[PDB]
Amino acid sequence: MAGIILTKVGYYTIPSMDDLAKITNEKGECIVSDFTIGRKGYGSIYFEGDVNLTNLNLDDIVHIRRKEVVVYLDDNQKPPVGEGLNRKAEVTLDGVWPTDKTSRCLIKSPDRLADINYEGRLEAVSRKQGAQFKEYRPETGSWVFKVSHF
Amino acid sequence: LWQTWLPNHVVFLRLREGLKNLLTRNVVFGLGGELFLWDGEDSSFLVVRLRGALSQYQRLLCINPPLFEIYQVLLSPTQHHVALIGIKGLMVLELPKRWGKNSEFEGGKSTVNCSTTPVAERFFTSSTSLTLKHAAWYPSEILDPHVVLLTSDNVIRIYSLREPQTPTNVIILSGRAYTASLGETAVAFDFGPLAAVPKTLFGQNGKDEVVAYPLYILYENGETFLTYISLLHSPGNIGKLLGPLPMHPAAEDNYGYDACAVLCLPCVPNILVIATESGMLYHCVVLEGLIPSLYVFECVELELALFSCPVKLHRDPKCPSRYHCTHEAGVHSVGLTWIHKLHKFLGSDEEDKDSLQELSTEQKCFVEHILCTKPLRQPAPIRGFWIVPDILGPTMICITSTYECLIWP
Amino acid sequence: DQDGRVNRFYELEESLTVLNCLRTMYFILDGQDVEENRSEFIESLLNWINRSDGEPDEEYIEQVFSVAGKKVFETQYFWKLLNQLVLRGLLSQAIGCIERSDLLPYLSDTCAVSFDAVSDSIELLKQYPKDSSSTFREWKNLVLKLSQAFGSSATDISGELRDYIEDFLLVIGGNQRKILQYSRTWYESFCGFLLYYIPSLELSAEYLQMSLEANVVDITNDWEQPCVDIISGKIHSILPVMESLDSCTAAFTAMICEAKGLIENIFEGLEDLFSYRNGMASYMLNSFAFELCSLGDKELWPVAIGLIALSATGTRSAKKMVIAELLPHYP
């Protein structure tokens, strides 16, 4: 591969890592628009616009977990806002459901989720973290929200 | 009678003039016939004698003052130490000795120096963003004083004053990330009353009964946990955490989110009060199971008894069936007149739940808005709340945002 | 209001009291505990208690606020009548009886310490939780704190007023011993227990027992024993007696008791309804219908026929026959 490192199981990119290789130009620079990095079954991060993936170690930078995501583990190794992956992005986290305090089961029923207005809860959880809620899909518990940077 | 002249004492002018120059605030505590008022600007206590003049008071100085703001003060069970509780630290002050016919500190000197010791100082400087969410004393009146600290890392640590930098016990309950489980973190805890428990509960043997205290832990999302603490027999790293306690009956709104305060009333079976930022108060009976469950006997909406503010809960020194709630709108008193109907044998089986349900349909608690702090422009929370226990009638002291001393009744 | 004989009024109120109690105990929480719905329950309970009997009748309020041989209001009477008010949830009146004599007087002057107690106690009373079982959990907290503080403090008042204030705070805190002490009737005790001690019906069994040890059931009125029965689980065997008080009420009572599933048709066997074959409720309803047919009021005939037609049991043909025989008598 021409610079990019991604080996953690379950992770992928759109375009695929193989496609990113061929996109690399004569001077070895990988610039792509609308790039996505995801982990099958847990979520993904969509970066609208052009980004320079040249010599980025995505294994060390991007971390997608259940109901959680991290980009750049420490602030010291983080580039300024607008450069690298520290920029505007749309995050999707899957398997996001509340737990019934009586049965201790996950609440996946759309009607039940509308009863407790889980969507409004996720709007609040987004603002409190500096993000803007976008939508929620009960069938898969997909919580989509935009972030100004990481 | 001090109920008459205390609001005119100069200490409130002093504190009021200190204004012109998050945790819920409580800058006052009482001991004997004395009232202690934390003066943030001078990092000292102003002590007013209520029993036995408007200008007279003692100043108890910190030999080594705290540099972080003190939000709450908390007298120890043995009453020889005061916890100075802030967001960015905790400091313990040792009270000086009394002597003289009036039992004044150090014979009535105008100013008395008090020894202080910081607690868990490493955790608040090493991790800059680590904050204190809740603190209390281990309830024992016999053992060395121990403070219990819940920090923003979702960990509870217990410290002896003999080793204030090294926890005697740690309870891992399990910000760089974006997360949907933002409420899976502890915001408060409260100890229940003394209980005798089998020594086998802590892994040791002999079929012998030991002293322990139930520790109830409240998550922001409203979930509750329970563990029994014995400073002698508990392991250094406590892992026998029970919960989340199932909450019965099933509620359409799942009892919401945004829980902010918990109180264990001193009764058997234990009864928990869970308060939310929206003004919801849940009265929960702890039913024995090995995981116990909660039966929400009733719910009270303070928004109706008059709302997005932090709510603080206070026990009543006289009656286990009464507690008080402080918020930006003032003080509410809540009387659970049905507490005395619940017997000590109650369990968590179906027939017990049905009996509790049937009983809740013919019993209701008494809620009263006893003090109103609502402004004419932006509401402000109170700074102090204390119930002076007198058998001839409890007197309540409430210090407003401007250090006005309201007394009830 | 429109009457020659008021005996009917009394009997109907009794029937109402017993029914209030029945609802409060089986028709709100559906087998759950008070936490399931603190608001509704306490509302019904507080209602049941304050409609059963008249006392404390305002004819008795002035009775003591008049009697002397003592200094102002400070004899066993004032306090008994203050505690009584508290035990019955009558907090408003309770407060009133205080702001009546020595709230600010004797206390704000004599002892400034107990004045603060007697005052912010009235404050807690002003905010007794009736919706959140959480708020109550914290309420009893502030109350027990108040009672401890006052408990050991500056005694600048009379030897009697001292305790007279402690007891008031104990009762409010839920002290069982005290709740029983200042109770005139078992239902005052039971009510108090649920309001200030522990709000759990899992203890009703015990509450009732203690209550009855303090004050026996008053056989003067017909509602007390039935209420005791309700509370203590044995709902049944009331239909015949209610049938003696009023056939109609008894009929529909049996009906709703069947609706709840508190009574059912155990029979398992003769081509007709008016028997023990169907329910006990079906039986009582059909009986009422037949009784209505001889009343000669054409307004109720639709009720009679409707009652028979809607009878949840019996062949359409059986009903056909019954109507075929009744209708010709329609006035």
Please tell me the distance from the alpha carbon of residue C154 to that of residue B283, in angstroms, as a whole number: 33
Phi/psi region, residue B357 (left: phi>0; alpha: psi -120 to 50; beta: rest), is: alpha
B88 exposure class (CB count in 10 Å sphere: 0-12, 13-18, 19+): middle
List CB contacts (< 8 A) between B177 and chain A.
Answer: 63, 65, 68-70
Determine the angle formed by the axes of helices B350-360 and C38-52, rounding to 10 degrees.
Answer: 60
- B334: closest CA among C43, C126, C203, C98? C126
The tokens of C97 are what?
A: 């009886």
Structure token pair of residue C212: 């009855």
Contact yes or no for C174/B319 (Cβ under 8 A): yes
A67 CB neighbours in chain B (<8 A) are 179-181
How far is the C-alpha of B116 from the C-alpha of B72, rounded, in Å?
Answer: 16
Residues 6+ apart with CB under 8 A from C21: B362, C48, C52, C223, C226, C227, C230, C231
Sole residue written with tokens 């508290």: C86
Give the integer Cα–Cα distance in Å for C131 and B117. Answer: 43
**Strands B90-94 and B116-119, how do they pair?**
antiparallel
Q: Left if phi > 0, otherwise alpha if psi is -120 to 50, otherwise beta: which for B106?
A: left
**Burial class of C31 by CB neighbour count within 10 A (0 to 12, 13 to 18, 19+):** middle
The residues with which B218 forms a beta bridge, in sequence order, are B188, B224
Look up residue B37 and give its two tokens. Answer: 């008022």
- Encoding tokens for residue C54? 């008249």
Cα(B253)–Cα(B261) distance, integer angstroms: 19
Cα separations in angstroms, A99 against A96, B176, B222: 10, 24, 11
- Give the strand order in the sheet containing B395-399: B384-388, B395-399, B405-408
For B391, which DSSP code? T
Tokens 């509308």 found at: A114
Give the mutation candidate from B178, B219, B350 for the A interface (greatest A CB count, under 10 A). B178
Instruction: Report d(CA B134, CA B129) in Å as an integer.
Output: 16
Instruction: Give start and end residues of each alpha helix (H) in B175-252.
Output: none
Q: What's the rounded Cα separation, in Å, for the pair B190 and B195?
A: 15
Rounded to 10 degrees, what is the CA torsion of A35, A41, A42, A47?
A: 10
Inspect the interface and report whether the beta carbons of A101 and B253 lie closer than 8 Å.
no
What single-letter amino acid sits at C165?
I
Phi/psi of residue A47, nearest 5 degrees: -105, 100
d(CA A14, CA C163): 79
What is the distance between the alpha carbons of residues B293 and B4, in angstroms, rounded to a whole number? Answer: 47
Residues 6+ apart with CB under 8 A from B60: B36, B44, B45, B47, B93, B95, B96, B105, B112, B114
How far is the CA of A81 from the CAs of A61, C256, C291, in angstroms?
15, 70, 88
d(CA C192, CA C215): 14
Return the residue in B248, B280, B295, B365 with the most chain C beta carbons within 10 A, the one to mutate for interface testing.
B365
β pairing state of B280-287 and B271-276: antiparallel
State both tokens at C66: 């008049």
SS3 B299: strand
Distance, C-alpha C8 to centroid of its chain: 21
Q: Which among C31, C46, C120 has the least Cβ separation from residue B357?
A: C31
What is the C-alpha radius of gyration for chain A, rounded to an integer number of angstroms?
17
Specify the resolution in Å: 37.0
Question: Min CA distance, A102 vs chain B (Å)?
Answer: 5
CB B333 within 8 A of CB C117: no
For this PDB entry, the determination method is cryo-EM
C residues 9..68 contacting B (CB < 8 A):
21, 23-46, 48
Residue B324 and residue B317: Cα distance in Å, rounded?
11
Of B178, B222, B249, the CB nearest to A129: B178
